[PDB]
Amino acid sequence: EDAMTVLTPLTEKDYEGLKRVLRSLQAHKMAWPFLEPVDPNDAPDYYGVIKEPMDLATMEERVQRRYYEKLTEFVADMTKIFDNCRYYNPSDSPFYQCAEVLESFFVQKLKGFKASRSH
Numbered sequence: 552e553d554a555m556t557v558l559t560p561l562t563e564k565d566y567e568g569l570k571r572v573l574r575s576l577q578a579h580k581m582a583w584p585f586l587e588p589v590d591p592n593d594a595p596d597y598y599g600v601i602k603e604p605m606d607l608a609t610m611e612e613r614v615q616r617r618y619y620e621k622l623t624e625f626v627a628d629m630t631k632i633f634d635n636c637r638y639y640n641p642s643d644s645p646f647y648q649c650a651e652v653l654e655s656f657f658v659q660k661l662k663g664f665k666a667s668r669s670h
């Protein structure tokens with residue numbers, strides 16, 4: 552990550568952009584596995600093997616409360632969603648596939664956000 556991403560505090564205008572990025576992901580057709588915390592009745596071992604769970608509703612709560620001080624911290628929570636999924640599930644499962652698609656979409660939107668900050 553470049554210096555701006557790591558060091559530049561998030562302003563109120565930056566927060567309007569983060570809200571837009573998050574809503575784009577929540578509306579994506581392949582976001583269904585990630586919208587809410589994993590239900591342990593569906594996956595009884597999940598919370599024994601994933602030490603730091605994350606989901607898009609937790610990120611929305613954090614954005615509303617202004618939890619994030621730097622863009623790097625927002626990117627780290629999002630990346631945890633996808634990395635947790637690829638560690639828990641095998642590479643041929645539909646959950647793994649959804650992580651591949653949605654991470655590529657996140658990178659496209661994140662590049663758009665970074666461009667808009669500087670110019």
Ligand SMILES: CCNC(=O)Oc1ccc(-c2csnn2)cc1
Pocket residue numbers: 584585589590593594635636639640646
């Ligand atoms: C293997 C058990 N069968 C099953 O479908 O349970 C789940 C439920 C949710 C997830 C999930 C969503 S986000 N990443 N992991 C994975 C497995």
